[PDB]
Amino acid sequence: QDADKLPHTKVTLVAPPQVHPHEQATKSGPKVVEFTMTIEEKKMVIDDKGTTLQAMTFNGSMPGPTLVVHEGDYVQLTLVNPATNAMPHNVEFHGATGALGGAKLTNVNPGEQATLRFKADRSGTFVYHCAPEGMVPWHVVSGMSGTLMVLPRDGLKDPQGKPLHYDRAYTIGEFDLYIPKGPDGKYKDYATLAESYGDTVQVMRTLTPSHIVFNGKVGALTGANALTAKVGETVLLIHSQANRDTRPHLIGGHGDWVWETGKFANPPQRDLETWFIRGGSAGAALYTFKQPGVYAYLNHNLIEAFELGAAGHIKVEGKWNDDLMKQIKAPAPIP
Amino acid sequence: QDADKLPHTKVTLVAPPQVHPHEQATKSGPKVVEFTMTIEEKKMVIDDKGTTLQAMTFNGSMPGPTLVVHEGDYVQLTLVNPATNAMPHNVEFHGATGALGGAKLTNVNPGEQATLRFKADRSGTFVYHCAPEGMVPWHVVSGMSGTLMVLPRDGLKDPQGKPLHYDRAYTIGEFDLYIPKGPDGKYKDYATLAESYGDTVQVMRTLTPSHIVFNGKVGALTGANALTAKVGETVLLIHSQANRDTRPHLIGGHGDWVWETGKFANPPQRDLETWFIRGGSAGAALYTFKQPGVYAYLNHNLIEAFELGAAGHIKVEGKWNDDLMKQIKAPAPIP
Amino acid sequence: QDADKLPHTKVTLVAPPQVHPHEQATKSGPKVVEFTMTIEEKKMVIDDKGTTLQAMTFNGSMPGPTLVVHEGDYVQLTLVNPATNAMPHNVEFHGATGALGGAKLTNVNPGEQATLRFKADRSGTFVYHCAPEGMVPWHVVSGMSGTLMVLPRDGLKDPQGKPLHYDRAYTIGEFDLYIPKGPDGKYKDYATLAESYGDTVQVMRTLTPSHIVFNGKVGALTGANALTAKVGETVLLIHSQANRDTRPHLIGGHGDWVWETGKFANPPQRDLETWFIRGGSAGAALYTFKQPGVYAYLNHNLIEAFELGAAGHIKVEGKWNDDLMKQIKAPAPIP
Ligand SMILES: [Cu+2]
Ligand SMILES: [Cu+2]
Ligand SMILES: [Cu+2]
Ligand SMILES: [Cu+2]
Ligand SMILES: [Cu+2]
Ligand SMILES: [Cu+2]
C-alpha cells in the first residue's frame, strides 16, 4: 500500500527500561505510526564518585526510548532540537532504507525540528542513533542511541514456526563512555558540552572506555531501579550497543531464544549462556523465569561489568525449585 | 524424574587437556553424577622469562577439569576450599538455573566445603567459574574457570540430524592475564595472593592483557605437551574463555562442525576457518584430520597468539595426501 | 578426480576493490586454476597527514587480489618474492588443508618463487595471508592478506535453496595498523622495512591500532575511488580481516543475505544491520540497492571508522523512492 493513504496512529513513548504498550501478533493492517522525540543535552552524574558526563540524549534518557512497530508499518518521527541545546543533531535509523538511514533528511540545528517517514519493511530490533557530519562517534558515545523494534505482524516465532510470546519487555542500552582525566588523575568536569569535545576525542581514539554503563549510570538498573519479574513470566530483553561489541548474560539463567544479530526473520538460537551484540546493533533474548531471587544481567567481560559498570539486576518473585537446583550440603568444615 | 530417587554415579576427573572418559550416545537413563573439586591457590610461572602469576585454580590446573554429563542428568559437585588457601571462593555454573548459577549456595571460606546439585537440562558446553561477591573478575582472570559439557543423550548431531562422533576430546581454556609491572618495567613477583590484588585490578581496568595463554602458560600445549592425533581421527576441541572474546582457528585445518555459541540443540556451522567464543562462554568444534604434521591451534588475533601466548600445537601422525595439497615446485630461483 | 589429469586454466588477477571476472553457477567441471602473485615490500602513505607505513603486499596492493574458484577446483599459485625485497615470505590459505595452510611449502627468500596446489574442497570466502616463522603477525598487519572465494558450483543459495545472484563483486580488506611514534609524538618514518620491526612489535603488543584502514589508506574507497552501483543492482561485498575483529555495516542499507563466518554451505542470515567478521576470516554480504545516493560502508565501531579510518563510500545512481523513505517536513523552526 501507499502510505499516504494509510491510517495514522500516534504512540506515546515511555522511558527505558520500560517499552511502550504494544501488540505482538496483531490483526491490524499496516499503519503510519507517529512518534516524537526531543533532544536534550545535559550534564549527567554517571558513577558513584561524582563523575559527570557532558551527555546528549533523545528524550532525556540513555538510551532513548524504544519505538515499536510491526513489519510493513511506516515510522513517522518528528525530531525536535530545542534552542536550549548547543549542537546540531539528526537521526540515523538502521531499520530504514536510504539517505544515510534518514540522517541526511533530519539535520536539525538548535531551534529546529524535522519529520521523517520510512517503511519498516524488515523485522528485528535495530539501533537508531545521531550521526551529525564530522562528529558522529562523539554524539553516539555521549548517549544518542536507542532501539526501533519491528515485530513480525504475527509475532515472534521459533525455528519451527511455533509462536513465542513475552509478558514484559525491557530495553537495555549499553554505553561505552570516554570521560577525560586531567593531569591530576581526576575526571574532568566541563561547564559546557562544547568544551568537552577535544579531550573526549583523544580518549575515544585510545579505544579504552573509562566506564561502560547500562541505561546512563553505574548501577542504573539496581536497587529501587532493578528490573522485576516473577517465576513463570517470560521477558524479552532488548540490548542495544551503537558503538562497541558486548556479550550479554543472565547469571543463573539463559537466553531461551536469542536473536543476537537481532533480525526476527532468522531462526533464533536456544539455550545460550552468553550472546553477542555487535557494535552498531540491537539484539533480543527471551527468558522464562523458573527460580526466584536477584539475578544479574551483565556484559560477560567481567571487568567491563564489575569494574566499569556494565551490569544490572533483575529481582524475581516466586517459589524456589529444588529439582532445578538444591544445596545438598551448606558450607561447613571440611570432613 | 525426582533426583532424590535416581541412581548416583561418581566420576574421577582428569587434568586438561584431556577429558575424563565418557559415552557420547548412551542407553543410560538420567543419573546424579557426583564430582569433587578442590581449590588450589598457587604461584605459577606463566611465560619463558620467569614471570609469575598469583593464580587461583580448581583442582590445581588452568582451566579446571572438564565435567561431562548428559542432558537430563544432575550435576552434584562437592567444592572444597582447604585451609591452606587465603581467599573465599564459590562456583557459578552457566549450565545451571538459579541462585547466581550456584554461587550463592557454594560460598566456602578456607577450611570449608559445600555440595551443590543442579539439573543439567540444557545440552552444550558451558563455562563454570568462581564468582565471590566483590572480587568476581579477579578470581576469573587469576585462573578459576573450566567447562561443563552436557551431551545430548543420543550424542552430537549435524543440522539434518545425522550422528556426529568423535574419537578424542581435548579441552582448551584460554586465559587473559593482567600481570602488573613496577616502575622499573619488570613484572612484579608477589609473596602472597592478597598482595597482588590492587595492582592487578588497575591493570584489569586497562582491558589490555599482559599475556593470553592456553592452559596456564605460554607454550603449555607445545613440545612434549602438544595435543596429538592421527589422520582419520575426529577430535572435539572444547574452548572456554570465561572473561574475554577469542577466535579459535586450526592452521591447515577447519572446524568441520562448530557450535561457536556452544549449545548442541542448535545446528552447527560447517567448514569454518575461524570461529568465535564470546567472553563468558565455551564452544566446541569437530575436525577429522586428513593430513599429518604439526598444526597450530590458536586465537587468530595473531598478536594475541604469537606475541601474547594464545597458541598451541597438534602433532598428527599418518600419510600425506597430495590430492589435498601438493608442492608443485619447491622454492627455487625466479626464472 | 585426480588433479594431475584435469584441465588447467590461467586467471589474470585484478586489483581491489574489483574482483576478476568469473562465473557464479557454472557448467564447467573441476579444473586446476593457475594464479601468480608477486610480493612487493614498499613504503605507503596511509593517511591525510603524510604518515607512512613500511608495508608488505601481495601484488602491490592492500589487500592482495581476490582469487575466485569453484568448489572442487584446485588452486595452483606461483608465489614470487623478487630480489628487490628484504624479507622472506610465504602464503597460508585458510581454504587449504595441510602444511600450515601451504605456508610450509611456500617459504621463499628474496630471489625465489614456489608453486603450491591445493584442493578448494570447501565453499566460502577464506583469508589467505603471509606467515613466516617467527614474524607472523608483523607480516599480516603490514599488509599481507587477501581473500580466496570458493563459489559453490551451482552459485550462491538462500536458506531454502533458492538461487542468489550478484551483478558486481567488491573486495574490501580491513587493516589494523600499528605505526610507531617517537618521543616527539610524531609517527616515525623509516628508511627500511627492517628498521621498523622492533618499534612496531611494541605497538602491536598494546593491541591498540594507530589506524584502521580499508584497502590501504584512510579514505581509500572515497572520492574518485568510491565504490559504485545503481538502483536495482545486487552487489556482493567481500570483507576480510586477517588479524582483528570488525563489524561491517552499510549506512542506509542492510545485509540482505550475509554469511558472516563466510562459508557458503551454511544458510545465510537476512536483514542484518551490522555483521561480524572474526579476526582471521573473510565474510560476504549481498545487497540490492533500492535508493540512490552516497552510502557509507564502514566498521560500526564508529571510533574505528570515523577516527581511525575504517570507512568507505558507495555512490549509487538511480531514482529516489518515497515509499521507502520520505522527508515529510524539512528542518524548520519549532512550532
Ligand atoms: Cu546528536
Ligand atoms: Cu549506524
Ligand atoms: Cu575464587
Ligand atoms: Cu559467568
Ligand atoms: Cu610476508
Ligand atoms: Cu591464518
Automatic annotation (TrEMBL), chains A, B, C:
<feature type="binding site">
    <location>
        <position position="89"/>
    </location>
    <ligand>
        <name>Cu(+)</name>
    </ligand>
</feature>
<comment type="subunit">
    <text>Homotrimer.</text>
</comment>
<feature type="binding site">
    <location>
        <position position="130"/>
    </location>
    <ligand>
        <name>Cu(2+) 1</name>
    </ligand>
</feature>
<dbReference type="InterPro" id="IPR008972">
    <property type="entry name" value="Cupredoxin"/>
</dbReference>
<feature type="binding site">
    <location>
        <position position="165"/>
    </location>
    <ligand>
        <name>Zn(2+) 6</name>
    </ligand>
</feature>
<comment type="similarity">
    <text>Belongs to the multicopper oxidase family.</text>
</comment>
<dbReference type="InterPro" id="IPR045087">
    <property type="entry name" value="Cu-oxidase_fam"/>
</dbReference>
<feature type="binding site">
    <location>
        <position position="8"/>
    </location>
    <ligand>
        <name>Zn(2+) 1</name>
    </ligand>
</feature>
<feature type="modified residue" description="Pyrrolidone carboxylic acid">
    <location>
        <position position="1"/>
    </location>
</feature>
<dbReference type="GO" id="GO:0042597">
    <property type="term" value="C:periplasmic space"/>
</dbReference>
<keyword id="KW-0862">Zinc</keyword>
<feature type="binding site" description="type 1 copper site">
    <location>
        <position position="144"/>
    </location>
    <ligand>
        <name>Cu cation</name>
    </ligand>
</feature>
<feature type="binding site">
    <location>
        <position position="130"/>
    </location>
    <ligand>
        <name>Zn(2+) 4</name>
    </ligand>
</feature>
<feature type="binding site" description="type 1 copper site">
    <location>
        <position position="130"/>
    </location>
    <ligand>
        <name>Cu cation</name>
    </ligand>
</feature>
<feature type="binding site">
    <location>
        <position position="307"/>
    </location>
    <ligand>
        <name>Zn(2+) 8</name>
    </ligand>
</feature>
<feature type="binding site">
    <location>
        <position position="129"/>
    </location>
    <ligand>
        <name>Cu(2+) 2</name>
    </ligand>
</feature>
<feature type="binding site">
    <location>
        <position position="144"/>
    </location>
    <ligand>
        <name>Cu(2+) 1</name>
    </ligand>
</feature>
<comment type="pathway">
    <text>Nitrogen metabolism; nitrate reduction (denitrification); dinitrogen from nitrate: step 2/4.</text>
</comment>
<feature type="binding site" description="type 1 copper site">
    <location>
        <position position="139"/>
    </location>
    <ligand>
        <name>Cu cation</name>
    </ligand>
</feature>
<keyword id="KW-0560">Oxidoreductase</keyword>
<feature type="binding site" description="type 1 copper site">
    <location>
        <position position="129"/>
    </location>
    <ligand>
        <name>Cu cation</name>
    </ligand>
</feature>
<keyword id="KW-0732">Signal</keyword>
<dbReference type="GO" id="GO:0019333">
    <property type="term" value="P:denitrification pathway"/>
</dbReference>
<feature type="binding site">
    <location>
        <position position="73"/>
    </location>
    <ligand>
        <name>Zn(2+) 3</name>
    </ligand>
</feature>
<keyword id="KW-0479">Metal-binding</keyword>
<feature type="binding site" description="type 1 copper site">
    <location>
        <position position="300"/>
    </location>
    <ligand>
        <name>Cu cation</name>
    </ligand>
</feature>
<feature type="binding site">
    <location>
        <position position="92"/>
    </location>
    <ligand>
        <name>Cu(2+) 2</name>
    </ligand>
</feature>
<feature type="binding site">
    <location>
        <position position="300"/>
    </location>
    <ligand>
        <name>Cu(2+) 2</name>
    </ligand>
</feature>
<dbReference type="Pfam" id="PF00394">
    <property type="entry name" value="Cu-oxidase"/>
</dbReference>
<feature type="binding site">
    <location>
        <position position="89"/>
    </location>
    <ligand>
        <name>Cu(2+) 1</name>
    </ligand>
</feature>
<feature type="domain" description="Plastocyanin-like">
    <location>
        <begin position="169"/>
        <end position="320"/>
    </location>
</feature>
<feature type="binding site">
    <location>
        <position position="167"/>
    </location>
    <ligand>
        <name>Zn(2+) 6</name>
    </ligand>
</feature>
<feature type="binding site">
    <location>
        <position position="129"/>
    </location>
    <ligand>
        <name>Zn(2+) 5</name>
    </ligand>
</feature>
<keyword id="KW-0274">FAD</keyword>
<feature type="binding site">
    <location>
        <position position="89"/>
    </location>
    <ligand>
        <name>Zn(2+) 4</name>
    </ligand>
</feature>
<dbReference type="GO" id="GO:0005507">
    <property type="term" value="F:copper ion binding"/>
</dbReference>
<dbReference type="GO" id="GO:0050421">
    <property type="term" value="F:nitrite reductase (NO-forming) activity"/>
</dbReference>
<feature type="binding site">
    <location>
        <position position="139"/>
    </location>
    <ligand>
        <name>Cu(2+) 1</name>
    </ligand>
</feature>
<feature type="binding site">
    <location>
        <position position="92"/>
    </location>
    <ligand>
        <name>Zn(2+) 5</name>
    </ligand>
</feature>
<dbReference type="InterPro" id="IPR001117">
    <property type="entry name" value="Cu-oxidase_2nd"/>
</dbReference>
<feature type="domain" description="Plastocyanin-like">
    <location>
        <begin position="45"/>
        <end position="153"/>
    </location>
</feature>
<feature type="binding site">
    <location>
        <position position="94"/>
    </location>
    <ligand>
        <name>Cu(2+) 2</name>
    </ligand>
</feature>
